[PDB]
């Protein structure tokens, strides 16, 4: 794909300040959408938006269709009287899921039994309009939330066999049973793709695209899984047989093993890779770029027996990369994809990649723990610049907080690189800025920052930290946080090294 030489801001908005315990899709995100159109940007990344369970990770979804209903925007609803908002006591500057899933979760139901009782015919009308035309995933998505709700919560391979193995019969009288519960699961999607249409028309006309985010793998614990058995590694009773994982490195003798369940790429293969080409289908109807993690795994998998508690048993699998994509640009005329391949890939990797034109990664705090080989220095990435540089991403702590823990020769190296590029700093705040400048007057295309860099916020602002049980997820912007002085230094910058 062609990418202008520009630049734009990484922020989800679950951290968009606001009221309620949390960012949503309302005048808080077009007042982002205003900033950095100010700033000069012209993409806002977001990290993926499906509905969250234990651990709150946008990367464990209960569904690869499915809007997470806690970035539903209560307002619209109670300005008709559809429900009473109440503020429990939520905090500032964070997201507490917890007082979240306690609260939010039964103002969502109150505002459905308060639309059934006020809504208007157009209204009932576009709602009963929506449940049509996604049936294709959503009578999946809200029976699953319907029966995991029926459940205590339980996953979808701990229900009764019968309703576990989709036995027709007892599936639709769990449905019939559920009918209530259904619907309003089905009204927490409508309330989100609309929201997230108005938004998504609101950054066009701002000029703003926006960049998506999807793992490669599904969650184990989702409606596609449970409703699709056929395309991935199951037993009889619904267990992974095996699972996605990383081998063993030098920090990981025992490697990774995520857990998450793998395709049976022959069986989707035959099916013209239908669940990828819908999954696609229904990302591109919110973005207009979108980032695939674990990109590897196209081209091979690290494929780990389910029995072993680690991943050190795993083996590396080939995957139809090749035919996928070929048939991802058959049917949209081209692949918006970029792809996240960070980490140690492979020829065949890069190959895939480049073969259809995707942009890789560059993530500049991983640029200097060694010399200047290191391929995430500007001066090596590809002449064609089709890639996009990060300070750090999610997973990385902000610029200040991993200069703070950064090592003697990292600080020393960096410091000295930013001065053969022309760039200085004086107090260790002024980093996460040098930085961003670096990445700007670097041959990438497009460069992305988080916005707890803009702020120079320290670790306290850190939206991940991969290995850590609890905090993540979490940080949230204060209102007016972003000045336009802030939006003023990013726009001269991007003047300076032609992004505009």
Not at 148 to 159: D, E, F, I, M, T
Request: aromatic letters at 14%; charged letters at 25%.
């Amino acid at each position: 794909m062609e990418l202008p030489r520009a630049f734009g801001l990484l922020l989800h908005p679950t951290s968009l300040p606001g009221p309620y315990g949390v960012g949503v899709l309302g005048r808080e995100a077009r007042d982002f959408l205003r900033f950095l159109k100010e700033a000069g940007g012209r993409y806002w990344q977001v990290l993926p938006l499906g509905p969250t369970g234990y651990g709150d990770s946008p990367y464990q979804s209960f569904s690869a269709f499915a809007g997470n209903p806690y970035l539903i925007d209560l307002r619209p609803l109670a300005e008709r009287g559809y429900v009473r908002l109440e503020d429990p006591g939520f905090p500032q500057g964070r997201v507490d899921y917890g007082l979240l899933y306690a609260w939010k979760w039964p103002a969502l139901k109150e505002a459905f039994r308060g639309f059934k009782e006020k809504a208007s015919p157009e209204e009932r009308e576009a709602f009963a309009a929506f449940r049509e035309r996604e049936a294709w995933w959503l009578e999946d998505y809200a029976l699953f939330m319907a029966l995991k709700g029926a459940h205590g919560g339980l996953p979808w391979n701990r229900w009764p066999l019968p309703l576990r193995k989709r036995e027709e019969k007892a599936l639709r009288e769990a449905k019939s049973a559920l009918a209530e519960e259904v619907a309003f699961h089905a009204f927490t999607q409508w309330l989100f793709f609309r929201q997230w249409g108005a938004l998504k028309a609101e950054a066009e006309a701002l000029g703003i695209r926006i960049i998506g985010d999807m793992p490669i793998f599904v969650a184990e614990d989702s409606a596609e899984v449970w409703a699709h058995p056929e395309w991935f590694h199951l037993d009889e009773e619904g267990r992974p047989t095996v699972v996605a994982g990383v081998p063993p490195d030098y920090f990981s003798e025992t490697g990774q093993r995520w857990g998450n369940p793998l395709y049976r790429w022959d069986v989707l293969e035959r099916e013209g890779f239908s669940f990828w080409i819908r999954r696609l289908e229904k990302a591109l109807e919110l973005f207009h770029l979108v980032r695939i993690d674990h990109f590897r795994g196209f081209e091979a998998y690290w494929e780990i027996p389910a029995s072993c508690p680690t991943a050190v048993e795993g083996r590396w699998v080939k995957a139809p990369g090749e035919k996928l994509f070929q048939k991802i640009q058959e049917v949209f005329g081209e692949v918006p994809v970029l792809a996240e391949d960070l980490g140690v890939i492979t020829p065949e990797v890069e190959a895939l990649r480049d073969r259809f034109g995707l942009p890789g990664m560059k993530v500049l705090q991983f640029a200097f723990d060694d010399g200047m080989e290191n391929p995430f220095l500007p001066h090596n990435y590809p002449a064609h610049g089709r890639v996009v540089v990060y300070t750090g991403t999610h997973d990385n702590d902000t610029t200040l907080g991993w200069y703070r823990t950064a090592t003697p020769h990292e600080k020393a190296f960096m410091a000295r690189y930013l001065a053969d590029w022309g760039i200085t700093f004086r107090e260790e705040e002024e980093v996460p800025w040098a930085l961003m400048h670096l990445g700007m007057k670097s041959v990438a295309r497009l460069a992305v920052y988080p916005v707890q860099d803009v702020l120079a916020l320290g670790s306290e602002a850190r939206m991940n930290y991969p290995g850590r049980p609890s905090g993540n997820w979490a940080w949230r912007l204060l209102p007016g946080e972003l000045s336009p002085e802030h939006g003023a230094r990013l726009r001269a910058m991007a003047e300076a090294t032609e992004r505009l």
